[PDB]
Amino acid sequence: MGPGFDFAQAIMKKNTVIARTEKGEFTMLGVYDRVAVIPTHASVGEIIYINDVETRVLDACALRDLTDTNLEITIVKLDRNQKFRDIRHFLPRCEDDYNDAVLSVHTSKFPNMYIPVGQVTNYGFLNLGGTPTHRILMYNFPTRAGQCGGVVTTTGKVIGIHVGGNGAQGFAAMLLHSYFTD
């Protein structure tokens, strides 16, 4: 409908796949080459389904900060025959707050779904499903089961992936450029 939705659509149409693990179907953001991200609670194993195709996992790393605190981001390298468009230049370098964000989801349950979530707070610490978690972004939208892995964008930046909610607020794990230096 406007330039926020335009940026979000450009990311969804080229940089997302549908990932299926034993824990469900997730929006998965491809970042560069065969490297993608997914919430750590997806419990990625040795094999994952990517757009309903059986795919070997070449590497999977559940990120933690230097205090050994969960970040809820798993970086996955996929044995896929095709590279993602390199979007690392759209990743923020530092923790921050944002205005006017969109949450975008693409699954069998929610295809082509875009949600204007508004203002995004650098919330920091969250007890997420019982697990102490750092680098959490918060938005005041009543997000629902099926939105995990959803991409959070502003105009010009890819800032996080949806990891949870409490019925009134939604929570995303930060994406930072430093996660994907190679």
Give a short summary of the structure:
The active site is at 41 (for protease 3c activity), 72 (for protease 3c activity), 148 (for protease 3c activity). With 182 residues, the protein is mainly β.
Helix content: under 10%
Overall number of structural domains: 2
Distance between the termini: 36 Å
Provide the β-strand percentage band: over 45%
- Classify the oligomer: monomer
Q: Count of helices?
A: 1
Q: Count all strands and give the number.
A: 12
Could you spell the SSE succession in H and E letters? HEEEEEEEEEEEE
Query: Which strand order does the major sheet show?
Result: 1-2-3-6-5-4
Shape: globular
Structural class: mainly beta
Query: From the alpha-carbon coordinates, what is the Rg to the nearest angstrom?
Result: 15 Å
Largest sheet: 6 strands, antiparallel, barrel
PDB class: viral protein
Keywords: Diamond I04-1 fragment screening, PanDDA, XChemExplorer, XCE, Viral Protease, 3C, viral protein
Assembly: monomeric
Entry title: PanDDA analysis group deposition -- Crystal Structure of Enterovirus D68 3C Protease in complex with Z30904160
Keywords:
monomer, 182 residues, mainly beta, 2 domains, six-stranded antiparallel barrel, 1 helix, 7% helix, globular, Protease 3C
Sequence-ordered SSE layout with sheet pairings:
Elements (H helix, E strand, L loop, with lengths): L2 H13 E6 L2 E9 L2 E5 L7 E4 L2 E12 L5 E9 L19 E8 L7 E16 L2 E9 L11 E4 L2 E9 L4 E5 L8
Task: Describe this entry's structure for a reader.
With 182 residues, this protein is mostly beta strands. The protein has one helix spanning 3-15, and strands spanning 16-21, 24-32, 35-39, 47-50, 53-64, 70-78, 98-105, 113-128, 131-139, 151-154, 157-165, 170-174. It has two domains: 1-15 and 85-182, no CATH class; 16-84, no CATH class. It is 7% helix and 53% strand. The strands form two sheets. It has a six-stranded antiparallel barrel. The protein has a six-stranded antiparallel barrel with strand order 7-8-9-12-11-10. It is classed as viral protein.
